Amino acid sequence: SPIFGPEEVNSVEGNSVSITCYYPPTSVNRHTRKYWCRQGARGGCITLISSEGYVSSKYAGRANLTNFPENGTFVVNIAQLSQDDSGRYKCGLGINSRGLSFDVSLEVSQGPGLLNDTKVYTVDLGRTVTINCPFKTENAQKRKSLYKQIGLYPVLVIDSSGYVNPNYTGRIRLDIQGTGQLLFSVVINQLRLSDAGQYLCQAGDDSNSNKKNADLQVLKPEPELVYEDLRGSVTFHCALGPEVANVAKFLCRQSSGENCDVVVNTLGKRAPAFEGRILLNPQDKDGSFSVVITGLRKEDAGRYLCGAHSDGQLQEGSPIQAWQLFVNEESTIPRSPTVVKGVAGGSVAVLCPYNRKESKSIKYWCLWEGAQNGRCPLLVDSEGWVKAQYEGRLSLLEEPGNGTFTVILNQLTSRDAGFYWCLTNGDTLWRTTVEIKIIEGEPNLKVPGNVTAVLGETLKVPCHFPCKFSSYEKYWCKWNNTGCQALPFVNCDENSRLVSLTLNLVTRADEGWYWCGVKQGHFYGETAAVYVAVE
């Protein structure tokens, strides 16, 4: 079940193949036994090549099996294929009679031998092609006809003078650079699946049933495999050519009953179930762009398609790109609160998990706009910068460390609800989203209004707390760009009330924002805020 790879693989004889399988990188899985095996009929699942030094007799000289532990993958090569090699197969780990496997289907076909009467043209659907047929000048004034064969009958439905087939509508144009020589061609844009096969082509006709053979093959693209897990993020890379660099471009998901279903467009559409956890970047000079989807759930598994078409949907005659995604779900990404609540005037605090092996990174805090396509304006970084309009009410803190940092956002209002993102600078990027809701109530800690200052004498400011906070520590701090640091002239007078602080001199040097806080040593808690003046 947590094992994944290519479901279908194809090649022709004499060639090589290179299969890759995936497993969760836990320590038991890196050291256990890997196998490739042939699921035959009558029960058994006989091993062909293994990780513990075993190579079979039929695979002698042709194969090996290398294991990459930091990837979490292992690769299998089979050279010099055949037609006894067609069948179903399995990757795996451990013992074969359990089920830590994944099925793979291998199909291999016969090549052409001593039949070189062919002229091929390779194309992926959405591009241009030529089908060249011999232009004879001994039929100088004769039609350059090209039939189509359904069965054995060359059906008279395409002429070369302005008559085209009722199914090949609007897209057949041809060029004149011979006209005295053998040179004409037919150029087709937007190749379909139904535009395949050999066609009865010729240029000019002596009446004695003369023939010619020349085919095309158009191919469907092969999906890049992406391996993700629960509560993580993914990134696609649509990289179509500059021929469609100014068409509307889309991204959907193939479903069961022949129904692609839109996830984003560039004409402004979105699913209901992807609100707050998706992006779409502005493209570069050559026409490639990024798509991010974070917080991955169980039902995001399946084939995805990106393309370009003039109305923003999947229609035939448009160039595509593919991916196939797997969600591991035996993940080691820690769980987190998805929604955090607060009241008008209160604070919040978020736990933001990253990877322990990337602890020398740089941390960021977004706010998902959702207006154009999706955008992160950055609000605060780990290096000492904050936004302008969030002054006095935001800071990022490195404690507790070792898997997790925290961020404090107070002085709430009912328009502060939304979806928020956090992101590190390392190589592997989990992006974690939390929703801030606003419900009504009363703030726990209690401070006065906006406290002025006298010129030439002292100030004192109180700050209460209720009685469940009687075992938690109390502190004060002064806020600047790097965060806020605790002060030593607080007293914490009462046993269950009135943490205060005075300022020994009214000069302008500390005319800033102040907080009043609560913490259980490492983990932080609620706070409030007042701004000081000097008159």
Binding site: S1, P2, S97, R98, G99, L100
Partner: protein
């Protein structure tokens, strides 16, 4: 009349039963227990008072009681009963009875998979 919880069965101590009556219009009621045909003395069991319910217009009342017996008596096959007296009943009494074999399931499939045939999936 409710059966015991399955947590108490797998410990071999006393097990517990619950009687419950609800929906009666004056708040006067009597509750007695039986074992087979013998009425137990009324200092073996606890009975709460009679209180009224949240409702829709018409007002009604409810009452519970419990009785704790030994697990060997339950697993023998001895039955127990809860009797309720009230004045809106025509014969002034109702009974319910419980033992094992009361909420037994009606379909059981047992398949034994031998050696040489393991096919476990993850």
């Amino acid at each position: 009349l409710l059966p015991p919880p399955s947590e108490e069965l797998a410990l071999n101590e006393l097990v517990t039963l619950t009687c419950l009556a609800r929906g009666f219009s004056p708040k006067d009621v009597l509750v007695r227990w039986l074992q087979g045909s013998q009425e137990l003395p009324r200092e073996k069991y606890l009975t709460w008072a009679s209180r009224q319910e949240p409702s829709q217009g018409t007002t009604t009342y409810a009452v519970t009681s419990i009785l704790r017996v030994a697990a060997e008596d339950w697993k023998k096959g001895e039955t127990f009963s809860c009797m309720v007296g009230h004045e809106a009943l025509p014969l002034a009494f109702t009974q319910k009875t419980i033992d094992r074999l009361a909420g037994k399931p009606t379909h059981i499939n047992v398949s034994v998979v031998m050696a040489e045939a393991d096919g476990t999936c993850y």
